Design a protein around this motif. Structure first.
Motif, short mmCIF file in Angstrom:
data_model
loop_
_atom_site.label_atom_id
_atom_site.label_comp_id
_atom_site.label_asym_id
_atom_site.label_seq_id
_atom_site.Cartn_x
_atom_site.Cartn_y
_atom_site.Cartn_z
N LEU A 174 0.82 -1.20 0.00
CA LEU A 174 0.00 0.00 0.00
C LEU A 174 0.87 1.26 0.00
O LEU A 174 1.50 1.61 1.00
N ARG A 175 0.86 1.98 -1.10
CA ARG A 175 1.33 3.37 -1.06
C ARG A 175 0.22 4.24 -0.48
O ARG A 175 -0.85 3.74 -0.16
N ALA A 176 0.49 5.53 -0.28
CA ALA A 176 -0.47 6.40 0.39
C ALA A 176 -1.58 6.86 -0.55
O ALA A 176 -1.92 8.05 -0.61
N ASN B 279 3.16 12.32 6.88
CA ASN B 279 3.28 12.54 5.45
C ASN B 279 4.66 12.24 4.89
O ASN B 279 4.80 12.22 3.66
N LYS B 280 5.65 11.97 5.74
CA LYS B 280 7.01 11.65 5.31
C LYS B 280 7.51 10.43 6.07
O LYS B 280 8.54 10.48 6.75
N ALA B 281 6.78 9.32 5.92
CA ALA B 281 7.17 8.03 6.47
C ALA B 281 7.73 7.14 5.37
O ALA B 281 7.17 7.09 4.26
N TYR B 282 8.81 6.42 5.69
CA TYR B 282 9.58 5.67 4.70
C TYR B 282 10.02 4.31 5.20
O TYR B 282 10.41 4.13 6.37
N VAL B 283 10.02 3.35 4.29
CA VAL B 283 10.47 1.99 4.57
C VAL B 283 11.95 1.84 4.29
O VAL B 283 12.58 2.68 3.65
N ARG C 265 8.12 5.53 0.03
CA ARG C 265 7.21 6.31 0.87
C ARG C 265 5.95 5.50 1.18
O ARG C 265 5.37 4.86 0.29
N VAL C 266 5.51 5.53 2.44
CA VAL C 266 4.33 4.76 2.86
C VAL C 266 3.41 5.61 3.72
O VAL C 266 3.86 6.53 4.41
N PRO C 267 2.13 5.25 3.78
CA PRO C 267 1.25 5.85 4.78
C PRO C 267 1.63 5.36 6.16
O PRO C 267 2.13 4.24 6.33
N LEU C 268 1.35 6.19 7.16
CA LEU C 268 1.52 5.82 8.56
C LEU C 268 0.62 6.74 9.37
O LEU C 268 0.79 7.96 9.34
#
Ligand code: CA
Length: 459
Positions: A13-15, A41-45, A310-313
């Motif tokens: 899932l991307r945002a 808005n700036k969460a990353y794997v 970039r991912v949702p969180l």
């Protein structure tokens, strides 16, 4: 007060969510959760593929600490001692629940879960797809079915509706115990198999088609040829770019899958509320990595591109917490490898060594000035390692000889107002200062004078 923790862990899932400004996605339940918490808005794997990302998150260690960068190596087939989330929580008196896809390999830490519901195989419910697979079996072929399906079926006809059911039942069973529960929803990982009513929320013809353009002067291995998608029946394997109709069908299936999972999130949240658990349960909504649905004319994950990392969180503190924030965003640069040490601090535990840090401060004060960088890796076989950094505005990536640390290629992409960039600015004389600053950040995480990258993937 030690709270319970409920984590929605959504695969691939991307945002692409209303609350993240998507103009396409219909996601009322996830949007509601965002109105009740802090949206990052700036969460990353730490690597854009399932197994390394998930074991990194579940151990609080980066993939390059574990040396596992591919998909065929369970954490516990190499590293039996590093302390994980379920291990630490179980030792500290919590019930530990794994539903759906949590670790990519369900054998990892299986005995550390007090309540375990295995991830389930894919289901095709349309008789035509069932017949295709039957004709495969009576032909000796192990081959995938199509890349998507839209059967006119109840939610529990696919695995995520079942996962929601298991979560609801287990919340009732565990209502008076301290617990941490991972609900691992599998869509929108391929195949995009979701009930008809979620497809019917969209018209495939409304989706904008991303430009079929690779970034100018990209590194030659920046993007894959999306073998994952090519493995599905009906996907042509001999072309650079898919046609508009199939591109739209895939975009449509990704969106339908998201709305299906959104409805399943709603069911679990409804149970949490009805059981009186919201007062003492922190809820986290997170993903294992981003994704491409036609961007750069490409598909799936498997890169160091911004769109894949970039991912949702979203984090919503329990409703009894006096300092809780609701409906606010944070632009703090945070990482999925921060989730485990965050949980350690949240639940008052003594945790293991970690490569991340707690973000509890930012959950409570979202505009706190925060970290300078977020980093990731991606291996291209044993000989090449990509290592990437963002400061929140620029992404800088070096593709290195994984043994010698020599640079084989470098990339600099501007990401001020888009997840996409079509121009590699590395070496451009107008960007020397940005490149030097980003390279310094990258090299602090990825030194060149400490030997080769660890390599522990196995057959
Ligand atoms: Ca995944």
């Amino acid at each position: 007060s030690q709270p319970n923790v409920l984590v929605f862990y959504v695969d691939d899932l991307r945002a692409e969510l209303g609350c993240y400004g998507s103009k396409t996605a219909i996601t009322p339940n996830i949007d509601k959760l965002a109105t009740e918490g802090v949206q990052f808005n700036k969460a990353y794997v730490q690597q854009a593929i399932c197994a390394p990302s998930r074991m990194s998150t579940l151990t609080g260690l980066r993939p390059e600490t574990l040396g596992i960068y591919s998909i065929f190596t369970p954490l516990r087939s190499v590293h039996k001692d590093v302390v994980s989330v379920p291990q630490l929580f179980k030792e500290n008196g919590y019930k530990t629940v794994s539903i759906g896809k949590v670790y990519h390999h369900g054998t990892d830490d299986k005995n550390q879960w007090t309540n375990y519901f295995t991830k389930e195989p894919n289901t095709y419910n349309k008789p035509e797809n069932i017949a295709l697979l039957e004709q495969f079996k009576k032909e000796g072929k192990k081959a995938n079915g199509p890349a998507f399906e839209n059967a006119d079926v109840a939610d529990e006809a696919y695995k995520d509706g079942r996962a929601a059911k298991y979560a609801v039942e287990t919340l009732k069973k565990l209502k008076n115990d301290k617990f941490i529960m991972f609900v691992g929803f599998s869509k929108p990982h391929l195949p995009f198999n979701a009930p008809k009513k979620y497809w019917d929320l969209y018209d495939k013809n409304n989706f904008e088609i991303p430009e079929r353009k690779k970034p100018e002067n990209m590194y030659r291995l920046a993007l894959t040829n999306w073998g994952e998608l090519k493995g599905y029946h009906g996907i042509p394997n001999d072309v650079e770019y898919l046609d508009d109709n199939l591109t739209r069908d895939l975009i449509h299936g990704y969106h339908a899958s998201i709305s299906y999972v959104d409805a399943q999130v709603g069911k679990v949240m409804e149970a949490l509320e009805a059981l009186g658990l919201r007062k003492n349960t922190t809820v986290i909504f997170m993903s294992d990595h981003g994704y491409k649905i036609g961007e750069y004319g490409a598909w799936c994950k498997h890169s160091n591109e911004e769109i894949d990392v970039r991912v949702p969180l979203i984090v919503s503190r329990e409703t009894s917490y006096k300092g809780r924030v609701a409906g606010k965003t944070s632009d703090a640069l945070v990482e999925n490898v921060d989730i485990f040490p965050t949980l350690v601090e949240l639940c008052g535990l003594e945790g293991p060594k970690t490569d991340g840090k707690s973000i509890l401060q930012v959950i409570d004060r979202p505009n706190t000035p925060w970290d300078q960088v977020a980093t990731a890796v991606y291996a291209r076989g044993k000989n090449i390692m990509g290592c990437t950094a963002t400061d929140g505005e620029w992404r800088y990536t070096e593709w290195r000889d994984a043994k010698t640390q020599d640079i084989l290629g470098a990339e600099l992409y501007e990401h001020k107002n888009s997840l996409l960039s079509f121009k590699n600015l590395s070496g451009n004389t107008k960007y020397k200062k940005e490149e030097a600053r980003m390279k310094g950040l990258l090299e602090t995480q990825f030194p060149r004078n400490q030997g080769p990258f660890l390599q522990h993937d196995t057959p």
